[PDB]
């Protein structure tokens, strides 16, 4: 339908004095298209782009902002520079809505240098603390890549986790744990306490139940001793739910040739 080479020259035209928000938006779309189907990439081309993209920033226009994020987001493992961005970044951060902020972290995370990190940590603290989960959620994912990269220092942060540990959004409830597990999973022990930690606890954005299941079993699995008092507690609960899947989840695992307790399983089953 359409072709890259011409476009590659032409994109900079938005960068040419040209005012017509639409035009450029479209052109950007195409680039992304070229890209989406599959595209070579490289530096020179990038660098030239680096000056090109950069001037264009008296835009207020929110949507305009969106577009940017995406593009930048494109550059990550093959990323080029950050300092410019800092100011920019800062701008999202101070930036009123919430929104702006999430995209930026998101590009950042495969790509970056230890160093700055410290600074940006503070920002993290803030994200960590904010009530509109979303951004906070946005924050989290980045970290993972940062874990890719590393994430250990991220570890240091466990504390924040705790302050966070109080949660009330379901999905969100879910997200926290995922991280956590990773964290403690390098560690049996705590977890044992964790269990306890949840033990007082039920779960908000369920999903949480489920990872935990795999988990809850996973210690037990090796013979994290007592199925009996703990496991079972879990099970009645598990059993009970209309989170039929959860019930299942337990059910599926317990595949026991003699029937560990053959009986009950059959009800669950009937139900199945």
């Amino acid at each position: 339908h359409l072709e890259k080479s011409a476009v590659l020259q032409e994109a900079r035209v938005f960068n040419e004095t040209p005012i017509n928000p639409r035009k450029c938006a479209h052109i950007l779309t195409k680039i992304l298209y070229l890209i989406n189907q599959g595209e070579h990439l490289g530096t020179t081309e990038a660098t030239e782009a680096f000056f090109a993209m950069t001037k264009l920033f008296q835009s207020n226009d929110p949507t305009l902002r969106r577009m940017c994020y995406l593009t930048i987001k494109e550059m990550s493992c093959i990323a080029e520079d950050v300092i410019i961005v800092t100011s920019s970044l800062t701008k999202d951060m101070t930036g009123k809505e919430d929104n702006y902020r999430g995209p930026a972290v998101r590009a950042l995370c495969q790509i970056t240098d230890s160093t700055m990190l410290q600074a940006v940590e503070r920002y993290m603290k803030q994200a960590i603390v904010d009530k509109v989960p979303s951004v906070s959620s946005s924050a989290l994912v980045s970290s993972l890549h940062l874990l890719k990269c590393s994430f250990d220092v991220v570890k240091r942060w466990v504390n924040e986790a705790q302050e966070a540990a109080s949660s009330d959004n379901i999905m969100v409830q879910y997200h926290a744990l995922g991280l956590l597990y990773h964290v403690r999973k390098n560690d049996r022990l705590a977890v044992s306490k964790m269990i306890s930690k949840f033990t007082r606890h039920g779960l908000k954005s369920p999903f949480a139940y489920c990872m935990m299941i795999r988990v809850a079993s996973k210690q037990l699995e090796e013979e994290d001793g007592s199925r009996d008092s703990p496991l079972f507690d879990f099970i009645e609960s598990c059993l009970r739910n209309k989170h039929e899947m959860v019930v299942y989840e337990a059910a599926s695992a317990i595949v026991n040739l003699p029937g560990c307790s053959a009986k009950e399983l059959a009800p669950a089953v009937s139900v199945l």
Partner: protein, 604 residues
């Protein structure tokens, strides 16, 4: 999380609406201004009046101590400034600065200044070295100047609060603020600063019951807080702990954690409204004026949690409220007794639970640490959680292999390796529990002795103490009991027989167990077993060891402190503050021993 914490009703007075309070640090004196019109200065410590002054008899709004200056500053709403040299209370000077109701003074400490805000919609600066010049006038008002606070951090820059709801922060080169921001939706009663230099917050007060946090460097309202029960007369930064003090127009205390931001607690001294507050900069004691009176409370621990391996690493955790993330210290070098030393750097940890106990395993090794009321024990080198649970009270089985617990009921269960030890299971009235070699249950203003395998009331002695330290091998044991102190022998054989015979006294315990050797009437800052030697601190700050019928002071210490640790090999004592400079004084254990043995007739 719990109030297993220091709250002390430090000092009380019931009085009037004590509007203002101002602190004398340099000697912990406090100045208070009343709605009576009389102002008084007290030494709280013994509830004693340092001086009182009738400055005016009109309510006296503002007060300062000028410590550097050695004089005390006062103003009443005769619109005059009266000066005393506090070095009597001899009154130096008077003059009329601000001609309207003078609300607040903020002072530059570094630089010789007194800043004032007054209701005249004026802020004037006056220079004391110039002998109360009105050096400069700061204006940019819209109403009475209700409050001035100096950002003392940058003394130099300061912030102003008015109830027309706005805040001007100023630069000297702005006898006007640099800017005004439109804070309140009420009025900005107050402006306050964030203790740390590192980051920057203000809290400002309103009775609207909404709190906004601001970061100056960005220049944002960081966030805005809600939850409240009644018009917050005041809310304050805890400078010691990260907590938020909230205060009300009814004198309600609510605390939100300045980290949890969860209501930690509400307290009622319904002494009505928060008129003033002033805080210890040492961040621990604070006073507020209320109507029915005022109350001052004392809120601190005296230590971090650390325990030292005799290689020479006192591993502590935290610093004061810093993460636990910081333990280590094997050092590497040597220097003179008086002179000071260097540390290593490699944190481990970054716990969450906030402790107040550290205790080593008996081989240093396993520490059990309690905090938030539960016990994390660490595998230390491991940095592993050795284990956890919730406490109430504790004894390691001294041996280094079991432990006991007092459940937040009060009835004993003990665990050795997570097995309850029921061979021993009195559960009598207690007070506290003591482990060691020989079991103490402190009960019924008595201290009662128990076996280690079955309980036995071995003995009961007269009263209760506070603390026990046992000699090392247990043998002669040292119990700290206020002023007074005792040293004892425990004699085994009797028991063995007696036990065999069975028929005994145990109300008293059995009078055929222990003997009372001698007692020193003693006050202990910190204290030590060197073996069975009691090497001790006194809180009178002499470090003495009771030796030979003698108590000798090896040395006397600044003021008294904490016993770093004497790594015997080195024969030295490492002395420890709480501010992480270690001093060492060598002894030589042998000398003591030499003495010990010879008296024993081990002359050779």
């Amino acid at each position: 999380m719990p109030l297993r914490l220091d709250i002390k009703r430090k000092l009380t007075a019931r009085s009037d609406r004590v509007k203002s309070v101002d602190l004398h640090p340099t000697e912990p004196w406090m100045l208070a201004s009343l709605y009576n019109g009389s102002v008084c200065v007290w030494n709280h410590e013994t509830q004693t009046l340092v001086k009182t002054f009738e400055v005016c008899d009109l309510p006296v709004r503002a007060a300062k101590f000028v410590a550097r200056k050695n004089w005390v500053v006062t103003g009443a709403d005769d619109m005059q400034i009266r000066v005393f040299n506090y070095n009597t209370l001899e009154r130096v000077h008077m003059f009329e600065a601000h001609s309207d109701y003078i609300r607040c003074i903020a002072v530059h400490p570094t630089q010789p200044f007194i800043l004032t805000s007054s209701d005249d919609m004026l802020i004037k600066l006056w220079d004391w070295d110039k002998k109360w010049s009105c050096s400069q006038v700061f204006e940019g008002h819209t109403h009475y100047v209700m409050q001035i606070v100096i950002n003392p951090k940058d003394n130099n820059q300061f912030a102003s609060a008015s109830l027309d709801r706005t805040i001007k922060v100023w630069q000297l080169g702005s006898s006007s603020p640099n800017f005004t921001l439109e804070g309140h939706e009420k009025g900005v009663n107050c402006i306050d600063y964030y203790s740390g230099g590192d980051k920057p917050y203000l809290i400002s007060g309103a009775d609207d019951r909404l709190v906004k946090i601001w970061d100056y460097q960005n220049k944002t309202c960081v966030q805005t807080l809600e939850g409240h029960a009644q018009n917050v007369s005041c809310a304050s930064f805890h400078p010691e702990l990260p907590i938020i003090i909230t205060g009300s127009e009814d004198g309600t205390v609510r605390i939100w954690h300045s980290s949890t931001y969860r209501l930690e607690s509400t307290l009622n001294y319904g002494m009505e409204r928060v008129w003033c507050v002033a805080s210890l900069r040492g961040s621990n004691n604070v006073a507020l004026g209320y109507d029915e009176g005022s109350i001052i409370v004392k809120l601190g621990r005296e230590e971090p949690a650390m325990s030292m391996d005799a290689n020479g690493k006192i591993i502590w955790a935290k610093h004061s409220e810093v993460q636990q993330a910081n333990l280590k210290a094997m050092g590497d070098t040597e220097i003179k007794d008086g002179e000071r030393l260097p540390l290593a750097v490699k944190d481990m940890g970054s716990c969450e639970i906030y402790p107040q106990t550290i205790q080593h395993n008996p081989n240093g090794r396993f520490v059990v640490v309690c905090g938030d009321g539960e016990y994390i024990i660490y595998t230390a080198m491991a940095l592993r959680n050795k284990s956890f649970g919730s406490a109430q009270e504790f004894a390691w089985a001294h041996d280094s292999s079991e432990y006991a617990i007092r459940e937040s009921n009060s009835i004993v269960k003990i665990f050795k390796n997570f097995k309850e030890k029921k061979s021993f299971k009195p559960d009598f009235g207690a007070e506290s529990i003591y482990g060691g070699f020989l079991l103490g249950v402190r009960s019924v203003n008595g201290l009662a002795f128990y076996d280690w395998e079955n309980t036995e009331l071995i003995r009961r002695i007269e009263i209760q103490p506070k603390h026990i330290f046992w000699s090392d091998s247990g043998e002669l044991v040292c119990i700290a009991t206020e002023e007074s102190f005792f040293i004892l022998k425990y004699l085994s054989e009797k028991v063995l027989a007696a036990q065999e015979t069975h028929e005994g006294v145990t109300e008293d315990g059995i009078e055929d167990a222990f003997e009372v050797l001698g007692e020193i009437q003693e006050i202990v800052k910190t204290g030590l077993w060197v073996g069975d030697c009691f090497i001790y601190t006194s809180s009178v700050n002499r470090l003495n060891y009771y030796v030979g019928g003698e108590i000798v002071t090896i040395a006397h210490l600044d003021r008294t402190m904490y016993l770093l640790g004497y790594i015997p090999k080195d024969n030295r004592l490492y002395l420890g503050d709480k501010e992480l400079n270690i001093v060492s004084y060598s002894l030589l254990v042998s000398v003591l021993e030499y003495q010990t043995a010879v008296m024993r007739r081990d002359f050779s």
